[PDB]
Amino acid sequence: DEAEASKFVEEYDRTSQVVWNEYAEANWNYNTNITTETSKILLQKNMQIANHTLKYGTQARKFDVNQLQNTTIKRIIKKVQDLERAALPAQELEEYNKILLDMETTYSVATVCHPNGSCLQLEPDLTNVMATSRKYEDLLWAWEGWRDKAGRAILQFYPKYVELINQAARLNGYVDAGDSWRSMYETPSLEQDLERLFQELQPLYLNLHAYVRRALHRHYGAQHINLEGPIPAHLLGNMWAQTWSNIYDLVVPFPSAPSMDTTEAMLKQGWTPRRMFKEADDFFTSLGLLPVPPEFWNKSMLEKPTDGREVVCHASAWDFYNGKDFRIKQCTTVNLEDLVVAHHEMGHIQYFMQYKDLPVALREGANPGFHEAIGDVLALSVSTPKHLHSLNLLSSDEHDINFLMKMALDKIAFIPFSYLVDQWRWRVFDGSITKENYNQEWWSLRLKYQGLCPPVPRTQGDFDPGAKFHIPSSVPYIRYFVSFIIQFQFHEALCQAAGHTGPLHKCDIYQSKEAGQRLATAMKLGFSRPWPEAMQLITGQPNMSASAMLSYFKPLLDWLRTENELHGEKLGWP
Numbered sequence: 001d002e003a004e005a006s007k008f009v010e011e012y013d014r015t016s017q018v019v020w021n022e023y024a025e026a027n028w029n030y031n032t033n034i035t036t037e038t039s040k041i042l043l044q045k046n047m048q049i050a051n052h053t054l055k056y057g058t059q060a061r062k063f064d065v066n067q068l069q070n071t072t073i074k075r076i077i078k079k080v081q082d083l084e085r086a087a088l089p090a091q092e093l094e095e096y097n098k099i100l101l102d103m104e105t106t107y108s109v110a111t112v113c114h115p116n117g118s119c120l121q122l123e124p125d126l127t128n129v130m131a132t133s134r135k136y137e138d139l140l141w142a143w144e145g146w147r148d149k150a151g152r153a154i155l156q157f158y159p160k161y162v163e164l165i166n167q168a169a170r171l172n173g174y175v176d177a178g179d180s181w182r183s184m185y186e187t188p189s190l191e192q193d194l195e196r197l198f199q200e201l202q203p204l205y206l207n208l209h210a211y212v213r214r215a216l217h218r219h220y221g222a223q224h225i226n227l228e229g230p231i232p233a234h235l236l237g238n239m240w241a242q243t244w245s246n247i248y249d250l251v252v253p254f255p256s257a258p259s260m261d262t263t264e265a266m267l268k269q270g271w272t273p274r275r276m277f278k279e280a281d282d283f284f285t286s287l288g289l290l291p292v293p294p295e296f297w298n299k300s301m302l303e304k305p306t307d308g309r310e311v312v313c314h315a316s317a318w319d320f321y322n323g324k325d326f327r328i329k330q331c332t333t334v335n336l337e338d339l340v341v342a343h344h345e346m347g348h349i350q351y352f353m354q355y356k357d358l359p360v361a362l363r364e365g366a367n368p369g370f371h372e373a374i375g376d377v378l379a380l381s382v383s384t385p386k387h388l389h390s391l392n393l394l395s396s397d398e399h400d401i402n403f404l405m406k407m408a409l410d411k412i413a414f415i416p417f418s419y420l421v422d423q424w425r426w427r428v429f430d431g432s433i434t435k436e437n438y439n440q441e442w443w444s445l446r447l448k449y450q451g452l453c454p455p456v457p458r459t460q461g462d463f464d465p466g467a468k469f470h471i472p473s474s475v476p477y478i479r480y481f482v483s484f485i486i487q488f489q490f491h492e493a494l495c496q497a498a499g500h501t502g503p504l505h506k507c508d509i510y511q512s513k514e515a516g517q518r519l520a521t522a523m524k525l526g527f528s529r530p531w532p533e534a535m536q537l538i539t540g541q542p543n544m545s546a547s548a549m550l551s552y553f554k555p556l557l558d559w560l561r562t563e564n565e566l567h568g569e570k571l572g573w574p
């Protein structure tokens, strides 16, 4: 029986590589060239890979995992018994695949038009408006418009999507889709663990919120900002108010200490998307890590096509499962924000390359959070004023606070948002939130966790969650919350390994081979062992902890408390 098991795994692996490689090709062609033809081909490939999953999944379920001796064989087979969507009857499967495609397409080609005829796409048009406009009404137009066109358009598909993904989940032994997604962490205490982590970062977030609210009150007027209430969701420089670094100009702690226009600098010296990824590639190699293959530079879509072609612009990294072909698809814009995103994606590519020799079933991160954290860890070092200056993109306590504030506007503000998304979906999946209450519960969470309010009252028919990529694209979000916490834990450990001393926020692990070695050994494990082991390999301990992130921002937390205190701020929103 143990012999049939190792043989089954070998067969599953060699056949999966081929079928998955073909699927990736079709999926890539659609993503980088949305047409009726590429869509039709993708849906056909869905049926093919599903047929393969059903065949091997059915066989896998015939094994009594309890009797299997080899742990690795045991782990792979248990995983293969989960057919995911392939567990659905042929009819429901095709309907489910079409629904996913329709939601993705609808989101990626949606536009917001003006009376004249000027229509704006999310990237880069609407994104730019949200980031640079300081006019309440213009920000509102873009904010409401996007939700009117993308969000409302997704509502007709969601209820059916929920029914079908939940059905597939139950057919694989789970109570619902949320349960299925959470299982990716193999951590029974997950919900409680995440809640405790969230609570530890509350004091810092609430102080940042109150400080930013005061600055907005200063700029937009007392008639539009309640100093004791939530903040209008369209004033944070980002379409979803998930990161607030774009309004840094409105909240600079010490305006006397000017900061170079990084974007202007990048554009000034002709930085290009290719250059941006080249720099990222250099950071990884400086650590002794792997460089992307030549094939990467030739097949990746690092810029939005002018081809008159329609594509899915949202940044993503691709593993074509042949251990050679890896690509990135991103409509990269030349600015610091996208430079960080470029590192984020290159981090995914590094993970792909690091575990490319493990059985395909184990080719994943220790847990989804780890996969999201790698790139961010390096980006933390890249973002330091000193490193940016070394790239000729930049030119002291007050400078420390200004820097920490810029970092907090992104990293801290994102904590409650990243926590909220799946708290909403898990309740949709378990039936607690019906389609009658989709939007109302989304905003109750938006208020409860982020302390935000909608600038325009929502009405029946609105489906704001649909206006956030990951919702219609059905990509789990809790991984980003985990990532933001652990990436600081990794930063802390890597810096210590690099011999750094002094304030953690001043660390730059560039060229540190000791740092790279820890990330490499951890990444090489793929999904072969419980994630606490990969956590231990990198940090010397096995748990997730907010200590590193709090330590990184300590100087800022103290400054914020003193600042908010002297202005008599009332934290929170009664």
Ligand SMILES: *[C@@H]1O[C@H](CO)[C@@H](O)[C@H](O)[C@H]1NC(C)=O
Residues within 6 Å of the ligand: 033, 035, 036, 037, 038, 307, 309
């Ligand atoms: C886009 O896909 C169509 C098929 O629908 C193909 O004929 C066309 O050449 C593709 N465009 C590019 C730029 O590859």
Ligand SMILES: *[C@@H]1O[C@H](CO)[C@@H](O)[C@H](O)[C@H]1NC(C)=O
Residues within 6 Å of the ligand: 047, 048, 051, 055
């Ligand atoms: C899988 O589905 C295809 C059609 O896509 C069908 O021809 C084939 O017989 C099914 N079974 C196997 C084992 O391939």
Ligand SMILES: *[C@@H]1O[C@H](CO)[C@@H](O)[C@H](O)[C@H]1NC(C)=O
Residues within 6 Å of the ligand: 006, 070, 071, 072, 073
């Ligand atoms: C378990 O089986 C896998 C797959 O064949 C093999 O690589 C691994 O070395 C085996 N482990 C032990 C302890 O025998």
Ligand SMILES: *[C@@H]1O[C@H](CO)[C@@H](O)[C@H](O)[C@H]1NC(C)=O
Residues within 6 Å of the ligand: 114, 116, 117, 118
């Ligand atoms: C249409 O409105 C936009 C506002 O985004 C403006 O920039 C554009 O010039 C207007 N078109 C004409 C023809 O005036």
Ligand SMILES: *[C@@H]1O[C@H](CO)[C@@H](O)[C@H](O)[C@H]1NC(C)=O
Residues within 6 Å of the ligand: 542, 543
């Ligand atoms: C380590 O995490 C476990 C949960 O797995 C928790 O019970 C324990 O208290 C944590 N230890 C420290 C020192 O944080």
Ligand SMILES: *[C@H]1O[C@H](CO)[C@@H](O)[C@H](O)[C@H]1NC(C)=O
Residues within 6 Å of the ligand: 297, 298, 299
């Ligand atoms: C990719 O490399 C090939 C050589 O294999 C070259 O012909 C092609 O033009 C390159 N493409 C880009 C976009 O650089």
Ligand SMILES: C[C@H](NC(=O)O)C(=O)O
Residues within 6 Å of the ligand: 242, 315, 344, 480
């Ligand atoms: C942070 C996450 N990044 C990503 O999908 O690349 C988001 O865009 O909301």
Ligand SMILES: [Cl-]
Residues within 6 Å of the ligand: 240, 464, 465
């Ligand atoms: Cl929203």
Ligand SMILES: [Cl-]
Residues within 6 Å of the ligand: 181, 184, 368, 369, 476, 477, 478, 479
């Ligand atoms: Cl996840």
Ligand SMILES: [Zn+2]
Residues within 6 Å of the ligand: 344, 345, 348, 371, 372
């Ligand atoms: Zn990612």
